[PDB]
């Protein structure tokens, strides 16, 4: 199966605070596995999955040190961006970064990622070629020219194609315990006297991606939502004429399933 790693980094400044607050969260196959937060009493990368305790103190000291550097980087960048956008003193501002790699089922690098957002909006991103930059805003051209001039792309490309892949392999080897499993959904339908409303529930599944469809032909649904125990929930409903209860069937599609479920009101 395919696999992925990401690091999602955020720096926030507020009118009150003197210095911004820096947070970094690492993910493997979309499950959180490490975390740094500068508001913490003793700022450090802490493990977040059980299988990560296997790393000795040199790992944690090293990564922590990188984090302290990123905090420096985000602080300065925030400062420069303020100037670029002619923003004045006395506002909240935020800067966000996503970086990482995608692997195919053969464990080869499918694609690398490296994008930034300012005030929640795309600021600059590294194209799929890991050589050129895309940046919409006129203000963002200043950073584009700077980074093109200095060879920034090559050093991100090296990380994304090397370290990112290399260490993700290692984490997966260590995670041939907790991460192998995907949880199939368990489906059931409920009745409500709206005409009546039929509601197809899907419960206890991982990962979140899932599809629900009523039939017949191709409705009200809610956004997929975490149960809070590592699994997810979703439902889809339709309004139906009273008595015509069995013309309608629900279908559930999920990667854990050997095949799609088919169910109706029992």
């Amino acid at each position: 199966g395919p696999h992925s790693m990401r690091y999602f980094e955020t720096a926030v400044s507020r009118p009150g605070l003197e210095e911004p607050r820096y947070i970094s969260v690492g993910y493997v196959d979309n499950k959180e596995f490490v975390r740094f937060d500068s508001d913490a009493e003793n700022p450090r990368y802490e493990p977040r999955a059980p299988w990560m305790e296997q790393e000795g103190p040199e790992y944690w000291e090293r990564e922590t040190q990188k984090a302290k550097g990123q905090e420096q980087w985000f602080r300065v960048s925030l400062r420069n961006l303020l100037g670029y956008y002619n923003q004045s003193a006395g506002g909240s501002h935020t800067l966000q970064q996503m970086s990482g790699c995608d692997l195919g089922s053969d464990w080869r690098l499918l694609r690398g990622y490296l994008q930034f957002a300012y005030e929640g909006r795309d600021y600059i991103a590294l194209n799929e070629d890991l050589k050129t930059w895309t940046a919409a805003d006129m203000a963002a051209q200043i950073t584009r020219r700077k980074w093109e001039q200095s060879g920034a792309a090559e050093h991100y490309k090296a990380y994304l194609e090397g370290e990112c892949v290399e260490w993700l392999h290692r984490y997966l080897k260590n995670g041939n315990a907790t991460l192998l499993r995907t949880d199939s959904p368990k489906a059931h339908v409920t009745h409500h006297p709206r005409e009546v409303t039929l509601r197809c529930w899907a419960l206890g599944f991982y990962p979140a991606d899932i599809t629900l469809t009523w039939q017949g032909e191709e409705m009200e649904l809610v956004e997929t939502r975490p149960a809070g125990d590592g699994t997810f929930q979703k439902w889809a409903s339709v309004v139906v004429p009273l008595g015509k209860e069995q013309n309608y069937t629900c279908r559930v599609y999920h990667e854990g399933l050997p095949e799609p479920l088919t169910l109706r009101w029992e």
Partner: peptide, 9 residues
């Protein structure tokens, strides 16, 4: 292992 960044914006 986390990336570290080069030129500041």
């Amino acid at each position: 292992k986390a990336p570290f960044n080069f030129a500041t914006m």
